Design a binder for this molecule. Structure first.
Ligand SMILES: Cc1cc2nc3c(=O)[nH]c(=O)nc-3n(C[C@H](O)[C@H](O)[C@H](O)COP(=O)(O)OP(=O)(O)OC[C@H]3O[C@@H](n4cnc5c(N)ncnc54)[C@H](O)[C@@H]3O)c2cc1C
Length: 257
């Protein structure tokens, strides 16, 4: 059918509610950094499909997904059991609002995420175009528990040594993990820390302004609303719709069903 059937190459569990996996990628699946695609499994005679951000670089011939594990979630109660060699259905045309083209030129790119909302941003931080367009890239990953800080080693130790753009990562990428419920070097919610100015002080950058700062926001619908309001308070204006460049972009990491 119009769905690709890919094969699982590797799986890694981060904790009780998070895991990632890599699959083969059909050469016909083209995507812009930041986009999502429908993926799923055949259940009771029908594909059980859900939107997933593509977490792998768009120039590499494989796909990677960073996923939640919902106890009785229709798709993830099954997806959590993926093993090497298993089949995964993937749709043909990715889409989404978190693309480079919809941000006006600027100096800093803030990637504001909570939970699995960091997924599209994993693609962004591995995209040479990101470093071509910005002086600084700030990946904020807000979670509740330290164990939810998936990809910590990749972001802080592996990516900076990248053979082709590791030096750009060292010079430009700032990683600001945040944890609310356990002791952690950076405590709190990113929205609160931005409103007080503490987030910027911690990372060594000036407060945001509409001329220099751009952002992509990915988290729960409530998180998007609250974070959008914070950026609006600094004078930034959201892209009004896909295709119309603005100061920041937003996309729901999931929906409360
Ligand atoms: C544009 C878009 C991109 C998405 N990208 C991803 C992604 O990269 N990774 C991913 O894991 N999910 C992502 N999601 C959510 C995903 O589509 C499914 O909701 C997820 O795979 C759970 O399916 P389910 O069938 O198990 O549970 P569902 O019935 O879908 O959802 C059950 C409940 O789980 C919670 N839930 C679902 N997904 C999440 C989540 N990711 N984090 C926290 N709580 C959640 C909610 O309380 C929800 O009501 C995305 C959603 C959208 C709209």
């Amino acid at each position: 059918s119009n769905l690709y059937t890919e094969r699982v190459l590797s799986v890694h569990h981060w904790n009780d509610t998070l895991f990632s996996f890599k699959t083969t990628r059909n050469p016909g699946l083209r995507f812009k950094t930041g986009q999502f695609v429908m993926i799923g499994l055949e259940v009771d005679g029908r594909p059980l499909m859900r939107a997933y951000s593509i977490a792998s670089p768009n120039y590499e011939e494989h796909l990677e997904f960073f996923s939640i594990k919902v106890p009785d979630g229709p798709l993830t109660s099954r997806l959590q059991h993926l093993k090497e060699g298993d089949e995964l259905m993937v749709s043909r045309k990715p889409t989404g609002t978190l693309v480079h083209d919809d941000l006006l030129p600027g100096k800093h790119l803030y990637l504001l995420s909570t939970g699995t909302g960091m997924a599209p941003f994993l693609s962004v931080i591995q995209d040479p175009e990101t470093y071509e367009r910005y002086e600084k890239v700030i990946l904020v990953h807000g979670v509740r528990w330290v164990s939810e800080l998936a990809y910590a080693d990749f972001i802080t130790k592996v990516l900076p040594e990248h053979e082709y753009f590791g030096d750009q990562v060292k010079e430009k990428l700032i990683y600001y993990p945040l944890v609310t419920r356990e002791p952690f070097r950076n405590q709190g919610r990113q929205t609160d820390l931005m409103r007080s100015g503490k987030l910027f002080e911690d990372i060594g950058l000036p407060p945001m302004n509409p001329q220099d700062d751009r952002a992509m926001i990915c988290g729960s619908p409530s998180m998007l609303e609250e974070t959008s309001a914070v950026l609006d308070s600094f004078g930034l204006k959201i892209s009004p719709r896909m295709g119309e460049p603005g100061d920041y972009l937003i996309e729901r990491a999931f929906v409360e069903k």
